[model samples]
Target: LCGRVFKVGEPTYSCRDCAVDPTCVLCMECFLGSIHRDHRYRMTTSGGGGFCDCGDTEAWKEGPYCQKHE
Candidate 1:
């Protein structure tokens, strides 16, 4: 709550899109306003959302996609 960057009404969600910098974060406004609707979502107080529209992960399709939904 004290560490949040945005208001509490939007809440926070963690993005699993491994392509992300891992230090990135997104608010609900940017999350949905962006391209995270299809990405995996985690109900978290943390705001490390993801980035997307990448060419391909180094090992893309090797395991699965949970981090490229920005």
Candidate 2:
């Protein structure tokens, strides 16, 4: 996983197609350049805060990582 933590007001992305944890989130770079790009996903402001799970096996059921992350 890239493991990029969300900044206080950074935008976060989540993919319903790969979500194994609700706390999981992705940075714009990872979200846009990832396999989940075409998947069912959403974006929100990072107020509560979280980290990118773009390559975490425990956080995703499939396509766990982006091409750059893998």
Candidate 3:
């Protein structure tokens, strides 16, 4: 999901080095194809419900959107 919602148990990717918030997360596709992969990132089965920030310009101070979404 690009800037869409994700539920618990779904795969989540977060960029510790590029995010404005610790909760900012991308879907697997966005994380892999995004510049975030070059930074510090983590993958986990989502422990809680959240939304993907792949294309949320307000969420990131830098590259807010992934390659595909951008």
Candidate 4:
């Protein structure tokens, strides 16, 4: 992991089998906006990288509706 601090708006996503590494942790937004979509991904906003279910009105799995995946 890098030394940069990730705030609430800067969510983190983890990959048990990340293409770069097995335990790679990257920004959720960056990862999603890229050409990568996996089934074994975890996201969170606290300090982990897992699926964020809490709608934050920023990341919208269903944009303009729910930001649960944002």
For all candidates in order, the CA lDDT equals 0.41, 0.82, 0.79, 0.41
Clashes of each: 5, 0, 0, 7
**Candidate 3, superposed: residue stretches over 4 Å from native:** none
Find the 10 residues in a row with the least total lDDT in model 4. Answer: 60-69
Question: lDDT: which candidate is best?
Answer: 2
Report the alpha-carbon TM-score of model 4 versus the true structure: 0.40
State the lDDT of candidate 2 residue by residue for 7-67, as single tens digits. 8889898898888877777789888888788999989898855678777888778777788
The predictions' CA RMSDs to the true structure, in order, are 8.9, 1.5, 1.9, 10.8
Order of the predicted models by TM-score, top scorer first: 2, 3, 1, 4
Candidate 3: lDDT of 62?
Answer: 72
Where does candidate 1 have its weakest 10-residue lDDT segment?
59-68
Residue 32's C-alpha lDDT in candidate 1? 56
Q: How would the candidate models be sorted by lDDT, starting from the highest?
A: 2, 3, 4, 1
Candidate 4 on 1-70: residue-level lDDT in tens? 2233456456666544433443344455545643234446666554533443223223323221112234
- lDDT tens readout by residue for model 1, 1-70: 1133544344554456632434444445545554444666554453333332232334222222223232
